[PDB]
Design a protein around this ligand. Structure first.
Ligand SMILES: COC(=O)c1c(O)c(C)cc(O)c1C(=O)c1c(O)cccc1O
Lengths: 140, 136
C-alpha cells in the first residue's frame, strides 16, 4: 500500500523546496538511495539516470546557472497510487545568456512516503545531453 | 468544491476512450462548452485552441493519421483538486510513413465532474506549429 496521503504531500513539498534551494545535497536528500530519473519522451532514447549519475551532473550544472528560480505552475497528487506530477518553470542566468526550461515531472513515492523513488521528466534536455558532455566529458 | 472521485474517474475514462476512438465528435463529447487546449511549454507560444478550433481542426488531422493506437503509460488522478494527468504514447500511419508522439496531458474537470474544462498538453507540436501555419 502507499504511504499516508499527508506524508506523501509533505514529501512533495520538501522535494519542491530542495529543488528551489538549488544545492546538490539539499535536493538529492529527497531522493531515495535507489531513485532513478528518466528523460521523456521515451522516443528520445535518453538513458535512465541513476542517483549516482545525477550526483555527478548537478554540481557543475547548478554552479553554471546563477540566480536560479523555480515556479510551480501545477501540482497533481494521486495519494491512492503514491504518485504525483509537477509542472514547473525554471530560469537562471548563465555566461552564455538566460536559461529557461519547463518540466512535466512525474513522481513516485517510496513506501514510507518520505522520499521520491522514481522520476520521469518531460523537459528540454539539450543542456544535459549536448552541453554538459562538451564542457565536462571531453575537457576533463 | 470538486465532484466525487468516482464521478471524476468516469469522466477521465470517457476522455481516454474518446481519444482512443479517434473521431472528432467522440473526442469532443467530453469537453465542456468553454474547454480550451493549451500546448506546453508556454515558451513555445502556441496559441490556445478553443472547442470550436478543435471541431474545425480534428477532422482533417485524424483523417491524415490512420491505424491510430493510444498507449496509456501513466494516469495520475487528484480527486481533491479535480485534476488529472495522463502520459500517453500515440502511434499512427501516414503516407509519409509511421507516426509517433507522446503527450503529458494535464486535465481539469468541471465542477459537476462530468466534463473536462481545461487541458494543458506537453507534446511534440510540430504539426500544429510548423505544418498548419505554413499551409495557410
Ligand atoms: C487529432 O489530434 C488529436 O485528436 C489530439 C488529441 O486527441 C489529443 C488528446 C492530443 C493531441 O495533441 C491531439 C493532436 O492535436 C495531435 C496528435 O494527436 C498528433 C499529432 C498532432 C496533433 O495535433
Amino acid at each position: 500500500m502507499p504511504a499516508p496521503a499527508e506524508v506523501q504531500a509533505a514529501t512533495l513539498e520538501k522535494f519542491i523546496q530542495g529543488w528551489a534551494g538549488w544545492t546538490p545535497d539539499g535536493f538529492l536528500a529527497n531522493w531515495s538511495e535507489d531513485c532513478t530519473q528518466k528523460t521523456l519522451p521515451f522516443s528520445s532514447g535518453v538513458p535512465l539516470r541513476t542517483r549516482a549519475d545525477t550526483e555527478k551532473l548537478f554540481p557543475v550544472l547548478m554552479s553554471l546557472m546563477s540566480n536560479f528560480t523555480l515556479d510551480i505552475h501545477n501540482v497533481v497528487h494521486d495519494a491512492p497510487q503514491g504518485k504525483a506530477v509537477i509542472y514547473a518553470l525554471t530560469k537562471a542566468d548563465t555566461p552564455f545568456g538566460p536559461y529557461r526550461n519547463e518540466h512535466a515531472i512525474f513522481l513516485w513515492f517510496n513506501e514510507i512516503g518520505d522520499r521520491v523513488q522514481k522520476i520521469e521528466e518531460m523537459f528540454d534536455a539539450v543542456v544535459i545531453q549536448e552541453f554538459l558532455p562538451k564542457l565536462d566529458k571531453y575537457v576533463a
